Structure formats: C-alpha cells, structure tokens
C-alpha cells in the first residue's frame, strides 16, 4: 500500500511518499529520514488518506 | 534566497524546499537531511531554477 509524509519546519519544508506492508512500516521508513536531522517535530496521522504530518 | 530539492528512488520519492544564504548552504541543508538513507543517489543542480535533483 502507498503511504505519504508532509513536512513542516523552519529550516526545511516538503512532501514525500513510499510503499510499505503497513502503516507502522511506512512510519518506520519515514522516521528513518525524519527524526534528528533538525526537525524533531510533533507527529500526526490520518488513516482515511494514508498520510502522516510532521510539525516543528 | 529560496532553494529546492527533488528526490527520485525505490524506497522514497518526494520534494523539499529551504531558504539559505547561497547554493552551498542550501546544498549543505539538503545533504544533512538526505545524507544517505540507503538512497545514496547521484546529485544534480540547475541554477536557472535554484533546484537540486537526487536520483537512484
């Protein structure tokens, strides 16, 4: 299944997309790129659209 | 000035944006977020659109 990530920050902003077995594997992939580069933000998720949102 | 990044690959795809002093600082921010993440892709830049592109 396709999953999506929305990135909200002050140093950087963006949007990304991946395919994983489930929402926790896509959450694990998105956390590999987006945990401690500088963002260190608050996570949110909407299952009805398979989308994650990360906010500084 | 605003700079941009485009990500092409097999584990993640996407687009991101930053505001930096020069193309070298925008390249440094984008290389801090996109250092490896198992992509390890080829890097390209077009100055006429202030945009960087990364491909597997």
């Amino acid at each position: 299944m396709q999953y999506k990530l929305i990135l909200n920050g002050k140093t950087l902003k963006g949007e990304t997309t991946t395919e994983a077995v489930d929402a926790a594997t896509a959450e694990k992939v998105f956390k590999q790129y987006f945990n401690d580069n500088g963002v260190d933000g608050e996570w949110t998720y909407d299952d009805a659209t398979k989308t994650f949102t990360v906010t500084e």
Side-chain angles (χ1 to χ4, degrees), chain A residues 20-52:
Chain A
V21 57
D22 83 308
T25 306
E27 194 192 283
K28 180 175 62 179
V29 174
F30 296 139
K31 281 180 174 175
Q32 235 57 224
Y33 290 69
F34 310 113
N35 72 316
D36 79 346
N37 51 43
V39 65
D40 190 40
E42 182 175 84
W43 287 66
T44 317
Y45 177 69
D46 293 278
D47 72 291
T49 188
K50 308 306 175 200
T51 303
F52 290 91

Side-chain angles (χ1 to χ4, degrees), chain A residues 1 4 10 13 15 17 19 21-22 25 33-34 39 45 47 54-55:
Chain A
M1 185 55 185
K4 186 181 178 184
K10 306 302 190 294
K13 304 181 191 294
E15 292 179 84
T17 325
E19 172 149 59
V21 57
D22 83 308
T25 306
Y33 290 69
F34 310 113
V39 65
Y45 177 69
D47 72 291
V54 187
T55 305

